[PDB]
Amino acid sequence: GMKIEEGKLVIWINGDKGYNGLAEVGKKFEKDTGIKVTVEHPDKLEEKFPQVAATGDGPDIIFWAHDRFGGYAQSGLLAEITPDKAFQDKLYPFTWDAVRYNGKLIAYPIAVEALSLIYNKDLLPNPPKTWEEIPALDKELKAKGKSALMFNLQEPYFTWPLIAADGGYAFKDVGVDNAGAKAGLTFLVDLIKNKHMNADTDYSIAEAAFNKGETAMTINGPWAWSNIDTSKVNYGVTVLPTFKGQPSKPFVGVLSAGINAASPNKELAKEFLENYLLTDEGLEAVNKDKPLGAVALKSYEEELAKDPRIAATMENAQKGEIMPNIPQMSAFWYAVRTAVINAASGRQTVDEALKDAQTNKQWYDALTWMRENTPDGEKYDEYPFETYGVISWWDYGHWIEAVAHRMPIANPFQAGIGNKYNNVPGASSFFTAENESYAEFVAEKLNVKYVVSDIEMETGKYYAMAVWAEGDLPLAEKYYGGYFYYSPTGTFGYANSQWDIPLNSIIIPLRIPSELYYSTMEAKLHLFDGSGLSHYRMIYESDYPAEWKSYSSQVNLNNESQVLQTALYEAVMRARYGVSPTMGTQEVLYKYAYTQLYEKKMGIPVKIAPSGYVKIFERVKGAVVTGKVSANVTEVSVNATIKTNQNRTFEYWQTVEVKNGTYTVVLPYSHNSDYPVKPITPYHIKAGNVVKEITIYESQVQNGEIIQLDL
């Protein structure tokens, strides 16, 4: 006979939830009513729902974290639910707040999720009730080869519960730079300054430290429990510590069930949810498949609560903050993530970090509003003639694009900046290129023939290039190491971390680059003068930075000892006022640091000496020299002395692997170019005890011609 259209309830839930258990509840409903219930778990259902809600594929009921439902309700996709007072009284009242758009309920709460304090009972049978207790506890444990506490410091989801504690921050606003946030962030950074925690501690490091028994406590959620069980750590889960007497405030996620505005069976959906799912029997079926954690239903929660871990989840959740809807949470996350990381790393003071977090949040909130309140929403989200422009100062264009999803008139991205994370050729991806092959990819795409670098690009501005290349402030931190200092006993030293520096030291306020920096194109070009590169040659350099032009009148710039002595002298002189060295001195210290820390591994020679403020290089095919290797060796080296137009000399080196009896080296300098920077020695090509000297014509370099030369 005829087909049927209102005969079924279609339910969508994510694949990581107990859908088989939910289907058992569906089977009971079907047995009782004859209405068949189909539980589906489509991939990306939370993205598909707004598209298909009104179609034949649309589900009658959708299960998801409450923080998507605001958006759904905003588009009119969810029916107002109508539970009576008796039914509302069956759930914890705070859970209903997660699904109320005021007055109106738009979903049924099912379960709640929040962070707890997790502790090792064998190291710490009585966990601390306050954050204030943690440093003394760490002192005790450090004596025994352990630490008190390790958790993910990289993500505001994990750090905000402490930062929000004082004043009990709630989302709309006070806002994020309020005095309570300053107190909490200050306490957090103090734990780092005093070595109770480490600023680079992330999720994986904290989880490994805890599950291998190295730290007494961690902060994490129910998703982390499985790995702990596997580790056989004797662990407990409990209420988060208070700060200044006030509860830590973790974000709360409430898994919720909304009813499709377009469903022709809203009353049956209500019946399924209220009288089948939200019962002890119903929640148990789902929970037995995959654990719901703490549930919104009081009667069942009181059964689950005999697992102390679940009791702890609910207690922290009742003390926490319902997570704001995704777009608000995102604006908050963007702003605060950088603040904590900058404060924790010493890039900024707590005050200035939270100050910028707040102003950044103003911008992110404004752009989020623009995204939801100006036309052509869905055409911009897939990110032509019928577009419009948003005009603002050029400093803001990338935010306008990334946050508002609108087209800025003044746009950083398309000013030839490019990036590394998406492989878009541009200045940032060229200068931070981690090998020449990558640099050549970028250069060829852009038809680069000349490179101009100054000492600012080498030093202070490199940071900006890395931020753009990585598309993120924190990600740029991997380009940097620690600090030079003089101890109170006069001993010169290097520390990976400022906090490892002895008290009363004189610290040179110049962050030294990490190994990664020295391998990038900007370093290869400006710091190493192009040494090692096959496709670039220097053709001109300007005069020295003025301070070094001046020093040269009383120091020999070719004596590394005198140069270093002079550099350290200036650095200390300025360091007493907390001022960084002059640019040329920064370069000298970068070179010195390389020779002390990284040269043994990387093997490129560099003289500790200053150099031209501005350097021009030409990009060339390079002359190819290749031949058989008769000597019993695995490498071939080529070197030449280059002299610039300032009469400074440096060494060009390149070393290649012998590949089955042959070598191939690509050389960018010629010996008859009309440029004022030129090699003043032939190339010296060495394979063991075999040494051969060669000079190259400019036509060979320009046309990439091949030279046969056996060794």
Author numbering: -1 to 170, 180 to 366, 500 to 523, 541 to 868
What does the paper say about this structure?
Oligosaccharyltransferase (OST) catalyzes the transfer of an oligosaccharide chain from a lipid-linked oligosaccharide (LLO) donor to the asparagine residues in the N-glycosylation sequon, Asn-X-Ser/Thr (X ≠ Pro). The catalytic subunit of the OST enzyme is the only subunit conserved evolutionally across the three domains of life, and it is referred to as STT3 (Staurosporine and Temperature sensitivity 3) in eukaryotes, AglB (Archaeal Glycosylation B) in archaea, and PglB (Protein Glycosylation B) in eubacteria. The STT3/AglB/PglB proteins share a common overall architecture, consisting of an N-terminal multi-spanning transmembrane region and a C-terminal globular domain. The genome of the hyperthermophilic archaeon, Archaeoglobus fulgidus, encodes three AglB paralogous genes.
In the present study, we determined the crystal structure of the C-terminal globular domain of AfAglB-L, as a fusion with maltose binding protein, at 1.90 Å resolutions. We connected MBP to the C-terminal globular domain of AfAglB-L, without a flexible linker sequence between them. In fact, MBP-sAglB crystallized only in the apo form in the absence of maltose, and the crystals diffracted to high resolution. In the final model, residues 171 to 180 in MBP were missing, as well as residues 524 to 540 in AfAglB-L. Interestingly, the C-terminal α-helix of MBP and the N-terminal α-helix of AfAglB-L were fused to form a long, continuous α-helical structure, which fixed the relative orientations of MBP and AfAglB-L in the crystal. We found that the two molecules of MBP-sAglB exhibited an intertwined structure, related by a 2-fold rotational axis in the crystal. We found that the Asn568-Pro-Phe-Gln-Ala-Gly573 segment in the AfAglB-L portion was the hinge loop region. Thus, the formation of the intertwined dimer is a crystallographic artifact and lacks biological significance. The overall structure of the C-terminal domain of AfAglB-L consists of three structural units, called CC (central core), IS (insertion), and P1 (peripheral 1). The additional sequence forms three α-helices (αA, αB, and αC), which is unique among the six structures. By reference to the present AfAglB-L structure, we concluded that the kinked helix of AfAglB-L contained a four-residue insertion between the first and second signature residues, Glu613 and Lys618, respectively, of the variant type of DK motif.
